[PDB]
Design brief:
- The chain starts with 5 loop residues before the first strand and ends in a 7-residue tail after the last strand.
- Helices cover 51% and strands 13% of the residues.
- Helix 11 packs antiparallel against helix 12 (273-298), helix 14 (361-370) crosses helix 20 and helix 14 crosses helix 21 (485-521).
- Strands 1-4-3-2-5-6 form a six-stranded mixed sheet. It has a four-stranded antiparallel sheet with strand order 15-16-12-17. Strands 8-7-11 form a three-stranded antiparallel sheet, with no helix packed on it.
- It folds into four domains: 1-194, Ribonuclease H-like superfamily/Ribonuclease H (Nucleotidyltransferase, domain 5); 195-309, Taq DNA Polymerase, Chain T, domain 4; 310-360 and 505-579, 2-Layer Sandwich (Alpha-Beta Plaits); 361-504, Orthogonal Bundle (DNA polymerase, domain 1).
- By secondary structure, the protein is α+β, with helices and mostly antiparallel strands.
- The longest helix has 37 residues, at 485-521.
- The chain binds a molecule of 2 linked components (GLC-FRU) (2 copies) and magnesium ion.
- A molecule of 2 linked components (GLC-FRU) binds at residues 455, 458, 462, 488, 492.
- The structure holds a DNA duplex.
Length: 580
DNA sequence: GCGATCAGCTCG
DNA sequence: ACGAGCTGATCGCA
C-alpha cells in the first residue's frame, strides 16, 4: 500500500516545524561536491517531498536547515552535512542519527541503509537503497515518482524508529555514547573531510618518475636471473619460476598454486639471488601503484586536495576507517615509502603540519582495566615497556637485556593485546608452539593481573554474551560458546582485544571533541585534518605552534582519567613527513 | 564484456 | 595474531 505524501512545488510553513525526520539524498557513494537528488520531510503536519533546486534556493528552508533549535532526525547526517557544505549551506540541529544509533546497538549487523536498521525493530515498510538505485554500472537515480516515494518512506521510518532506538540505547547505558560522543564527532569528521588535505602533485609525479626508473632496473635484473621474462605480479607465474624452474624449496602452499608471501620469500632469500630482487620489486611496485598513481587519481585538479571519507559506522571495535583515499595507511616503516609523506602539505602559505600521538595507549588501557600492579607501576615510572617485559620474562637486569630479547618481548606484548595464543606467537617469532607457550606462561607469571583479566573477560563474555569498553561501546560474541576450537578461540581473542582497542578508540574520539571545543574557545585557526587510530594530525599558522605544543597534548592526555597516566608525543614541520 | 575472489601489500 | 583498504591478476560466466 502506497504511502501518502505531498509532492510540493514550493516550501511552506508547515514544513518548518521544530521537529522532523529529514532526508537529503546523495546517491553518489563519494558525497564530496556531489548532487542532492531529492529531499523528504516528515513531521507532525505530514509527509513532504521537495525538489532540491527549489528547497535549497528557498531562504526560509535554508534558514530552517541551519537553525539549531529546529531538531532533525536523520540517517548518515554527515553525508548530507558535507554535501550541503560544498553548496555553502549549513546543517544544524541534528539530534538523532539512525545510522550511528544502529551502529552502537550492534556493529556486527553491518547496517548501511535505513532498511537494514529498520529491520532490527521489525519495521519493513521501506526498501533497501540497492533495490531502488541498483548496483554497479546499472546504478541510477529513478524517475521522480519512484524517487519521491523512496525518500518519504525512509523519512517515515526514521520518524517512527527514533524512540525505539533511544529506549534500547538507554537500557544499554549507551544513550550518552550516542548523544555526547558519536553524534558530536560526526560533525567534526564532516569539517575535516570538507577541509581536505593539500597534496604536492609535482612532488608525487617526480617520485613516480624515479620509481619507474628503479622498477625498470629491478624488473630486468629479475628476468636476467630467471633466464626468461614473465609477469612478476602474477603469484601463479612467479610460483612456476621459483619452485619449478629454479627448484627452490616449497615451505608453504596457498590454494591455486604455491605461496609467495613476503614471509616465505624472506626464508628463500638464502637460496637464490632472484628472491631479494622480487621483494624489492614488490616494495617499489606497491608505492608506485597505490601511493603514487592511486593518490594522483583522487586529487582534485582545481584545489590539489584529497578529500577522504571517514566511515564512522563500520569497525567492530569502534575505530574509524578511511577511504578514497585511505589516509590511515600511508607508508612510514620503510624510509623509501616514508618519503611519500613529503607530498602532504599545509593548505596555506606559512602554515605547518602538527601531529600528536598517544604513546602505548593500548598497553596503558590494559594496565588500567586489569589493574595489574606490575604493569601499572611500569607506566607510573614511564619505563620502556618492551625492555621491562624482557627483564621480567627472562629474569635479567636492564643491562642484561639484548636486542633480540627486547624484540621477542615486544612480540609477546602485541600478542597479549591482540589476544594471546601459542600458535599465533610461534608463527610470529618463527619458533615452536612449546617455546611460545613458555614465553606466555612466563609473561602471566610476571603480570598475574593481566592473566586474571584475560580469564575473567572471557568468562564475562560467555555470561553476558558481549564485552564492553570504557565508554560503554558493545560487541556481541556469539561464537564464544562454539564447540569448534578454532571458531571459539577467535571469539575469545576478540573478547580479550575489543575492550582494549575499543577503549582506546573511545578515548581518542572524546579527545577530538574536547580539542575542538578548546580550539574554538581560544579562537585558534588550527584545525583537525586526520585521525590515524592513536594519532591526530592538524594544520595551522606557524604562529600557533607554540600554543599547540601545550594545548594538544594536554587535551589528549586529560580526555579520560585512568589508573595510569596517558602520554602524548608530538612533532611539527613543513610536510607530514617532517612532522616527526 | 562485466563483477567477484584470490593474493599481496600498507597502516595502527 | 587484532582491526581496516587498495591494486593487479585471474577465475566467473552472462
Ligand atoms: O557515507 C558513509 C556511510 O555510508 C555507508 C553506507 O550507508 O557507506 C557508503 O559510502 C562509503 C564512502 O563513500 C563507501 O566506502 C561504501 O561502499 C558506501 O556503501 C556507511 O558504511 C558509511 O558509514
Ligand atoms: O583451562 C581454562 C582456561 O581455558 C580458556 C581458554 O584459554 O577457556 C576454556 O575453559 C573455560 C572453563 O574454565 C571455558 O569457559 C571456555 O569456553 C574454554 O575455551 C581460558 O579462558 C581459561 O582460563
Ligand atoms: Mg603511537
Amino acid at each position: 500500500k502506497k504511502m501518502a505524501f505531498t509532492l510540493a512545488d514550493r516550501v511552506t510553513e508547515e514544513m518548518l516545524a521544530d521537529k522532523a525526520a529529514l532526508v537529503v539524498e546523495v546517491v553518489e557513494e563519494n558525497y564530496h561536491d556531489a548532487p542532492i537528488v531529492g529531499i523528504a520531510v516528515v513531521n507532525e503536519h505530514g509527509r513532504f517531498f521537495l525538489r532540491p533546486e527549489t528547497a535549497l534556493a528557498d531562504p526560509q528552508f535554508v534558514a530552517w536547515l541551519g537553525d539549531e533549535t529546529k531538531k532533525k532526525s536523520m540517517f548518515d547526517s554527515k553525508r548530507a552535512a558535507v554535501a550541503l557544505k560544498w553548496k555553502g549551506i549549513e546543517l544544524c540541529g541534528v539530534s538523532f542519527d539512525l545510522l550511528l544509533a544502529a551502529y552502537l546497538l550492534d556493529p556486527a549487523q553491518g547496517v548501511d541503509d535505513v532498511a537494514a536498521a529498520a529491520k532490527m525493530k521489525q519495521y519493513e515498510a521501506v526498501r533497501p537503497d540497492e533495490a531502488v538505485y541498483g548496483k554497479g554500472a546499472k546504478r541510477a537515480v529513478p524517475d521522480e515518482p519512484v524517487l519521491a516515494e523512496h525518500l518519504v518512506r525512509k523519512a517515515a521510518a526514521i520518524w517512527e524508529l527514533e524512540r525505539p532506538f533511544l529506549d534500547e540505547l538507554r537500557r544499554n547505558e549507551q544513550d550518552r555514547l550516542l548523544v555526547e560522543l558519536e553524534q558530536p564527532l560526526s560533525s567534526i569528521l564532516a569539517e575535516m573531510e570538507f577541509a581536505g588535505v593539500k597534496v604536492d602533485t609535482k612532488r608525487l609525479e617526480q617520485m613516480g618518475k624515479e620509481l619507474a626508473e628503479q622498477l625498470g632496473t629491478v624488473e630486468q635484473r629479475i628476468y636476467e636471473l630467471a633466464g626468461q621474462e614473465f609477469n612478476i605480479n602474477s603469484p601463479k607465474q612467479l610460483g612456476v619460476i621459483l619452485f619449478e624452474k629454479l627448484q627452490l624449496p616449497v615451505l608453504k602452499k596457498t590454494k591455486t598454486g604455491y605461496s609467495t608471501s613476503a614471509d616465505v620469500l624472506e626464508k628463500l632469500a638464502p637460496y637464490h639471488e632472484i628472491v631479494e630482487n622480487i621483494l624489492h620489486y614488490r616494495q617499489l611496485g606497491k608505492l608506485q601503484s597505490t601511493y603514487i598513481e592511486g593518490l594522483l587519481k583522487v586529487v582534485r585538479p582545481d584545489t590539489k586536495k584529497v578529500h577522504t571519507i571517514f566511515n564512522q559506522a563500520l569497525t567492530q571495535t569502534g575505530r574509524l576507517s578511511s577511504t578514497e583515499p585511505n589516509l590511515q595507511n600511508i607508508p612510514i616503516r620503510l624510509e623509501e615509502g616514508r618519503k611519500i609523506r613529503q607530498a602532504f602539505v599545509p593548505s596555506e602559505s606559512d602554515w605547518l603540519i602538527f601531529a600528536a600521538d598517544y604513546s602505548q595507549i593500548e598497553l596503558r588501557v590494559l594496565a588500567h582495566i586489569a589493574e595489574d600492579d606490575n604493569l601499572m607501576e611500569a607506566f607510573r615510572r614511564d619505563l620502556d615497556i618492551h625492555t621491562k617485559t624482557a627483564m621480567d620474562i627472562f629474569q635479567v637486569s636492564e643491562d642484561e637485556v639484548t636486542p633480540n630479547m627486547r624484540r621477542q618481548a615486544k612480540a609477546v606484548n602485541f600478542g597479549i593485546v591482540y589476544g594471546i595464543s601459542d600458535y599465533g606467537l610461534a608463527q610470529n617469532l618463527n619458533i615452536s608452539r612449546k617455546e611460545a607457550a613458555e614465553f606466555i606462561e612466563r609473561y602471566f607469571e610476571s603480570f598475574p593481573g593481566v592473566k586474571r583479566y584475560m580469564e575473567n573477560i572471557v568468562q564475562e563474555a560467555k555470561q553476558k554474551g558481549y564485552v564492553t569498553t570504557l565508554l560503554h561501546r558493545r560487541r556481541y560474541l556469539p561464537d564464544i560458546t562454539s564447540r569448534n576450537f578454532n571458531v571459539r578461540s577467535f571469539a575469545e581473542r576478540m573478547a580479550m582485544n575489543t575492550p582494549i582497542q575499543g577503549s582506546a578508540a573511545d578515548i581518542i574520539k572524546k579527545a577530538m571533541i574536547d580539542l575542538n571545543a578548546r580550539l574554538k574557545e581560544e579562537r585558534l585557526q588550527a584545525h583537525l585534518l586526520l585521525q590515524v587510530h592513536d594519532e591526530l594530525i592538524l594544520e595551522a599558522p606557524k604562529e600557533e605552534m607554540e600554543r599547540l605544543c601545550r594545548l594538544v597534548p594536554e587535551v589528549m592526555e586529560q580526555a579520560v582519567t585512568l589508573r595510569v597516566p596517558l602520554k602524548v608525543d608530538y612533532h611539527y614541520g613543513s610536510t607530514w613527513y617532517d612532522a616527526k
